[PDB]
Amino acid sequence: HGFVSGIVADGSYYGGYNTDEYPYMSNPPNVIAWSTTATNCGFTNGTGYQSPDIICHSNASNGSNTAVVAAGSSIQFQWTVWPASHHGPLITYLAPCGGNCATVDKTTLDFTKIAAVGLVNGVSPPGVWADDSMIADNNTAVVVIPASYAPGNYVLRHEIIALHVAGNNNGAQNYPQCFNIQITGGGSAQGSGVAGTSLYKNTDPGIKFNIYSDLSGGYPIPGPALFA
Ligand SMILES: [Cu+2]
């Protein structure tokens, strides 16, 4: 599996939380990325959709730094690697920190879906998905912060849901990665957010989904509605 090793945010590179290195330090470095204990490169499945682990991954603790990002600009998430079998959507959220993102209680965050891509070509199951486009693009996912989004501090929660086992109850594998950003801009728009532990249920149609059977009915991307 992969994790996000860094991001390019409004033109500038920020190193992420190197989960294969930083957990083995008594004094890990400051980063905009949240720490996790997911040293096995693992995931949170449906057994943890109501655990705080779903918010920013296993045992996640606040990143200490925050990246300044102009509204309307692009963020690129650099994943270390991604397996071809792990087809699924890429979903990205913003939750206001109401203060410094370095100290917000992650369980109080209310996430707004700002980007989501799912099934691209279902003609030949298991199909071609957003993560396959990410793989082709140097293992990099891309999102646009809405130009109209209200300035302030936000947790940016970027996630792949791998669906290779998702026909099973609790089979979908969620890979959330969180980063602190401060948006600047001239807009005032903000979505109505959803608590991390309310984003997904193991019975949801976009969670318990068989990618190996006929895909002509499409894929309903899970989670709350996309910000408009
Ligand atoms: Cu796997």
Instruction: Break the chain into its structural domains and give their ranges.
Output: 4-198
Beta carbons of 182 and 198 less than 8 angstroms apart: no
**Helices first, then strands: H and E counts in the chain:** 2, 12
The closest of 223, 70, 71, 225 to 160, measured between CA atoms, is 223
User: In angstroms, rounded to a whole number, what is the distance separating the alpha carbons of residues 163 and 212?
Assistant: 10
Residue 40's Cβ-count burial label (10 Å; 0-12, 13-18, 19+) is: exposed
Beta carbons of 223 and 113 less than 8 angstroms apart: yes
Beta carbons of 89 and 190 less than 8 angstroms apart: no
| Interacting residues of 24 by C-beta distance below 8 A, sequence separation 6+ | none
Classified as helix, coil or strand, 49 is: coil
Cα-to-centroid distance, 100 and ligand 1 (Å): 34
CATH class for the region spanning 4-198: mainly beta
Cα-to-centroid distance, 159 and ligand 1 (Å): 15
User: In angstroms, rounded to a whole number, what is the distance separating the alpha carbons of residues 36 and 19?
Assistant: 7
Q: How many CA atoms lie within 13 A of 125 on its CB side?
A: 13
Cα-to-centroid distance, 16 and ligand 1 (Å): 21
The closest of 177, 224, 130 to 7, measured between CA atoms, is 177
User: In angstroms, rounded to a whole number, what is the distance separating the alpha carbons of residues 91 and 105?
Assistant: 22
Pairing type for strands 173-184 and 67-70 reads: parallel
Instruction: For residue 46, give Cα distances in angstroms to 2, 3, 139.
Output: 19, 19, 25
Resolution at which this structure was determined, Å = 1.2
Rg (C-alpha) for the chain, rounded Å, is 16
Cα-to-centroid distance, 163 and ligand 1 (Å): 10
Tell me how many degrees the CA angle 66-115-145 measures, rounded to the nearest 5. Answer: 45
The closest of 201, 215, 210, 134 to 224, measured between CA atoms, is 201
Beta carbons of 89 and 160 less than 8 angstroms apart: yes
Experimental method: X-ray
Residues forming a β-bridge with 93: 113, 157
The closest of 158, 142, 141, 136 to 84, measured between CA atoms, is 136
Cα-to-centroid distance, 183 and ligand 1 (Å): 34
Cα-to-centroid distance, 1 and ligand 1 (Å): 6
Cα-to-centroid distance, 117 and ligand 1 (Å): 20
DSSP-assigned letters across all residues of 60-78: -B--S--EEEETT-EEEEE
The closest of 177, 168, 159 to 89, measured between CA atoms, is 159
Cα-to-centroid distance, 39 and ligand 1 (Å): 14
Beta carbons of 14 and 31 less than 8 angstroms apart: yes
User: In angstroms, rounded to a whole number, what is the distance separating the alpha carbons of residues 2 and 80?
Assistant: 5
Residue with tokens 């989501």, as numbered in its chain: 116
Classified as helix, coil or strand, 183 is: strand
